[PDB]
Scaffold this active site. Structure first.
Site, short mmCIF file in Angstrom:
data_model
loop_
_atom_site.label_atom_id
_atom_site.label_comp_id
_atom_site.label_asym_id
_atom_site.label_seq_id
_atom_site.Cartn_x
_atom_site.Cartn_y
_atom_site.Cartn_z
N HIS A 1 60.81 -23.83 16.31
CA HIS A 1 61.66 -24.80 16.97
C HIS A 1 62.61 -25.45 15.97
CE1 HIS A 1 57.84 -26.46 15.79
NE2 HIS A 1 58.48 -27.56 15.49
N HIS B 1 61.65 -23.97 12.22
CA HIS B 1 60.39 -23.87 11.52
C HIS B 1 59.23 -23.75 12.51
CE1 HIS B 1 60.44 -28.11 12.75
NE2 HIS B 1 59.14 -28.17 12.48
N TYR C 1 59.63 -40.98 12.66
CA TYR C 1 60.97 -40.48 12.38
C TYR C 1 61.97 -41.37 13.10
CZ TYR C 1 58.55 -36.28 10.95
OH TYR C 1 57.68 -35.43 10.35
N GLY D 1 51.33 -36.55 7.39
CA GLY D 1 52.10 -35.94 8.47
C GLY D 1 51.34 -34.79 9.16
N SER E 1 54.73 -38.37 15.13
CA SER E 1 54.39 -36.96 15.09
C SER E 1 53.11 -36.73 14.29
CB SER E 1 55.56 -36.20 14.49
OG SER E 1 55.33 -34.82 14.58
N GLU F 1 55.04 -25.13 12.35
CA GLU F 1 54.27 -26.15 11.65
C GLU F 1 53.56 -25.57 10.43
OE1 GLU F 1 56.03 -28.06 14.02
OE2 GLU F 1 54.66 -29.24 12.83
NI NI Z 1 57.93 -29.19 13.87
#
Ligand code: NI
Ligand SMILES: [Zn+2]
Length: 347
Positions: free
Chosen positions: A269, A181, A170, A163, A281, A183
């Protein structure tokens, strides 16, 4: 440039779309990174895959049922591992009467419904599926191979981080959530919505991130004591009304099928899915990221959380600071408004 740190949207031409890294540098030249999140609508002619009906021989190994507890705009989301299922099983639950998108007029109405109903009828999220939906042939903005400096982790040290340097899929349904959160390692992310219903996003500008952290720490002193970065648990949901009440500046945007969202280093975000959809992603880096990686506050309470050795980046890209950094004297203060060096060409 973008003094309200609002979310910007970009429409590159096919010529512009070819150079991923350069285009990120460009949107930073325009101030996009101040918002923490930007939208990129790809050229009309570009598509990453011919069609999406051939899907179901793809397994979701670990779907999660999202149980939410809380009240008054503050919630904790518990993720309960369920049995592997096909896209087909997911879609059927998604579209069932109990567990499909409500009828609504405007976004604002769907949002009210989300925040009113998020503790009821726990949905299933087909999260963190290893794999890609791009065809091998597609060269532009290919989430499976973006060719940024992030590649140094895989090419120099050999480590693959699922990831992070690899693609995740997703599968969403109505009211599935992603908690507040940044990244891993405060990297960038790219998110492409392959098909289906929209995904709505909230964003807090990086220049106001510490203010959200302070707020979060205030509301959960339990979690603050046990962990230096509990938001990295991805369990904490906070409504826009709560943010507004405590004077946290934030923006909102909806991503529709066929659009990219970019998150920036230290861009907090959160959001939710409108209905059945599929997003792909991964994380990525620019030179500006390096200082963020060096300064990232990591989860200290559960191990096998994502940690990248910054050593190779400092040596190579900040050779003048390498010594200062090795002896822990560095002391650089990040300016969240500064665009990445690669943007010089455009400034
Ligand atoms: Ni994120
Ligand atoms: Zn932790």
């Amino acid at each position: 440039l973008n003094p309200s740190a609002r979310i910007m949207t970009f429409y590159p031409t096919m010529e512009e779309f070819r150079n991923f890294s350069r285009y990120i540098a460009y949107i930073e030249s325009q101030g996009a990174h101040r918002a923490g999140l930007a939208k990129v609508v790809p050229p009309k002619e570009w598509k990453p895959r011919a069609s999406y009906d051939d899907i179901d021989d793809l397994v979701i190994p670990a779907p999660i049922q999202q149980l939410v507890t809380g009240q008054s705009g503050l919630f904790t989301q518990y993720n309960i591992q369920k049995k592997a299922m096909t896209v087909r099983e997911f879609r059927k639950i998604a579209n069932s009467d109990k567990y499909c998108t409500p009828r609504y007029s405007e976004f604002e109405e769907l949002e009210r419904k989300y925040w009113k109903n998020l503790t009821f009828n726990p949905p299933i999220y087909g999260a963190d599926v290893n794999g890609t939906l791009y065809e091998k042939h597609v060269d532009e903005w290919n989430i499976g191979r973006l060719r940024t400096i992030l590649d140094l982790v895989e090419k120099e040290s050999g480590i693959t981080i699922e990831g992070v340097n690899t693609p995740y899929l997703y599968f969403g349904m109505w009211k599935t959530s992603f908690a507040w959160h940044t990244e891993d390692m405060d990297l960038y992310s790219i998110n492409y919505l392959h098909f289906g219903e929209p995904k709505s996003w909230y964003s807090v500008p990086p220049e106001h991130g510490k203010r959200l952290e302070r707020l979060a720490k205030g509301f959960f002193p339990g979690s603050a004591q046990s962990c230096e970065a509990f938001l990295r648990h991805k369990m904490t949901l906070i409504s826009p009304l709560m943010l507004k009440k405590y004077g946290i500046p934030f923006d909102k945007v909806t991503q529709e099928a066929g659009e990219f969202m970019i998150t920036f280093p230290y861009g907090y975000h959160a959001g939710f899915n409108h209905g059945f959809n599929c997003a792909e992603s991964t994380n990525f880096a620019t030179r500006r990221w390096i200082e963020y990686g060096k300064q990232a506050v990591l989860c200290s309470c559960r191990k096998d959380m994502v940690k990248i050795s910054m050593d190779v980046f400092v040596r190579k890209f900040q050779p003048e600071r390498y010594r200062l950094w090795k002896e822990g004297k560095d002391n650089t203060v990040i300016d969240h408004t500064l665009p990445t060096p690669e943007a010089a060409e455009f400034l």
